[PDB]
């Protein structure tokens, strides 16, 4: 199982409800992060066991509250961040500019939901962050951006 460090998930943290869209936090919330361009931005999680997979879909929709939401124009999903296996528990962090996926929609003042999709032996597990990307955001806090190692 994980949990988003940053940006923050939609809503608490529950173990059993990760199986849901959205972690059963399917509305989209208005308390929303700021997320920078300028390609200081990452995706910080923590996972209590190793090996997993990890990626992320994307929806440019304000109002992402269903899978569908999550798809481009020919119907695959939009994803934000390619897929990939991790061998280490605790943190895993991603740099993240939104700036580089091929998607109109993505600009300063623009509202997203970046939907963390897990898989490490228990379930397709998924969390949800809405954020809205601006140009710079100061005193974007990296602490929480490192990767555990063994
Ligand atoms: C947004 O507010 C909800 C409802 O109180 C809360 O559960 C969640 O942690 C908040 N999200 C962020 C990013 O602060
Ligand atoms: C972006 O989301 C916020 C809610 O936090 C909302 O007030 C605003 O209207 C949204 N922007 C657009 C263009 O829908
Ligand atoms: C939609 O996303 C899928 C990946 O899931 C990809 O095969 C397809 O090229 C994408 N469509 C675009 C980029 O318009
Ligand atoms: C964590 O590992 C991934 C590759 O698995 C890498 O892209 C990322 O930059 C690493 N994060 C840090 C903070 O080193
Ligand atoms: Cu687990």
Redo the contacts with the bound molecule.
């Keep these: 199982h994980f949990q988003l460090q940053w940006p923050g998930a939609r809503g608490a943290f529950v173990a059993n409800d990760e199986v849901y869209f959205c972690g059963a936090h399917n509305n989209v919330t208005?308390?929303?992060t700021d997320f920078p361009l300028d390609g200081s931005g990452f995706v910080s999680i923590k996972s209590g066991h190793a090996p997993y997979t990890v990626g992320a879909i994307i929806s440019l929709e304000?109002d992402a509250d269903a899978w569908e939401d999550f798809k481009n124009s020919s119907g695959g999903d939009q994803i934000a961040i390619a897929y990939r296996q991790v061998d280490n528990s605790g943190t895993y962090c991603v740099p993240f500019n939104p700036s580089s996926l091929n998607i109109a929609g993505i600009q300063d003042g623009a509202?997203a939901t970046i939907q963390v999709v897990y898989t490490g032996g228990d379930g397709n597990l998924y969390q949800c962050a809405d954020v809205?990307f601006r140009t710079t955001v100061a005193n974007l806090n990296s602490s929480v951006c490192t990767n555990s190692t063994h």
């Design positions: 208005t308390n929303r304000t509202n809205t």
